Amino acid sequence: VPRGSTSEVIEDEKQFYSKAKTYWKQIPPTVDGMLGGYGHISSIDINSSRKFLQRFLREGPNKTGTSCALDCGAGIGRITKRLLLPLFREVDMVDITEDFLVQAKTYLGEEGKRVRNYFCCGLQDFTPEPDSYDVIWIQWVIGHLTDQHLAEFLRRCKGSLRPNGIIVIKDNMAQEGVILDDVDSSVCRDLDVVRRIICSAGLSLLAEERQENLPDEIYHVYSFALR
């Protein structure tokens, strides 16, 4: 069978997290470090993310607001800089790697003065303030959490949404199963697994979209908008 949960592939959860922390600690605080050598795809990524988000910003009963966003596993703030700060009055960042948050303050420049909180914490230990965010953006990090921590984190995120708020997950998806990468200490899950986890967190799908124009050799990437 393919594997369907992280408990089938993670030998030692403390080591799964410690190894990941050690891996990111020796990556340079640059876009290419964030994107694993694929820094050149950033603009394609941000353009598609922007179009996806703008679906939820149109006027109407369910319009997502534009006061505050949370960037989860934000790194140096690639997404905060080019996608979120232009659209949200304030942005909070959370990441496990202190060096990245320190570099963010340089990387983000003057606009970075609208970053309110820089939280240096693992997602598995982070509880966002209730009723605080219009958008919670979670990109290229969910693979770093166990199934139980991911489900729990998505529940706490749900409790921190403002009225009409949404959660966006954008990540690599496996063709089938749950695949361990033992170098960066992360998993890649298939769409059925990810959807199962979203549902277990009491969330529903508003939209799902495949990222186009990526290099042929990398994992497929999908975006989900949730509430």
């Binding site: 964030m34 994107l35 694993g36 695949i179 960066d184 050799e217 990398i218 994992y219």
Partner: peptide, 6 residues
């Protein structure tokens, strides 16, 4: 992070 299919 984005990455080559293992």
């Amino acid at each position: 992070r984005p990455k080559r299919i293992a």
